[PDB]
Design a protein around this ligand. Sequence first.
Ligand SMILES: O=C(O)[C@@H]1C[C@]2(C(=O)O)C=C[C@@H](O)[C@@H](C2)O1
Lengths: 162, 163
Amino acid sequence: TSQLAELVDAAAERLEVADPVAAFKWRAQLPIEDSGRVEQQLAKLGEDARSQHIDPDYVTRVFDDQIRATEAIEYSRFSDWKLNPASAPPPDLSASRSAIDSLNNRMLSQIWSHWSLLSAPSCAAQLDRAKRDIVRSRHLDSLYQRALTTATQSYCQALPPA
Amino acid sequence: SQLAELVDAAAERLEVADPVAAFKWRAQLPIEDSGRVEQQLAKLGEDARSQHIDPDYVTRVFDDQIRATEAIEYSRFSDWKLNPASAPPEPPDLSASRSAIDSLNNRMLSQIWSHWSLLSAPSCAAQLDRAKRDIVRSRHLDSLYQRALTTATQSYCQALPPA
Ligand SMILES: O=C(O)[C@@H]1C[C@]2(C(=O)O)C=C[C@@H](O)[C@@H](C2)O1
């Protein structure tokens, strides 16, 4: 089991919030993106990182990836639903909000716990193993696999060049 | 197929979704532009009436085409959210893309008029499936564009024969 399995699993579960959120936005005729909103969300995550003695710039980069990957899923659904509106699957977003708050906390806990590994040469391999295992355990489809890659692309920190 | 030119025009117009998406991505503009949709449907409705073509049929067809186009734009935004480096950095202006669309709109309505007797005939469904096969091949349409072309053309065979 990869040391990054809990982090990646949390990231994947958080991606899955894309579906109820997109279903809601579709019915409510709301757009997917909102730059001001995301700026606020990222700022709050940075504050969370500071209070937890985690590098806020790192957390900001990682969650920027996470949020873009999530928006990618939402846009893919909107595409599908434009072609086939009868397929659009609702309710309000309070459940999703609570889930994201809990998953944010889980993710930050693992960034803290596994900071040495995230800084290490073994990060890339351990991330690849974690992804493999979560793709399988969560039965992630091609869209979610691409999203998980995007979401996690900044986990592993650059190494000294000499 | 006698519907190949119409389907080709439809597919060509679908392909304008790419530069349109690219422009909107760079400019951070919404994908849906209800004003522009209304403008087109109004003009086309009037052209149909003036040429004595059933405007309700024409509106339906273009609604389908427009929805399919929006679907492609959403899909590209999805792709670019996953990998922003794949977004075309210097797309043509939206104005230019809209002019190209205006011309394709006209070509499609001209083809609808020309092939009214086939669009309203029982052989329409067969001829449409044939045209789609051939244009999918000739344009090398991928999975997304195949879906989009089905959506764009789904009302073609609804045309009523003249009284
Ligand atoms: O902005 C646009 O011009 C493009 C083209 C489009 C159409 O299909 O005509 C018209 C309006 C928009 O909602 C979509 C679809 O994007």
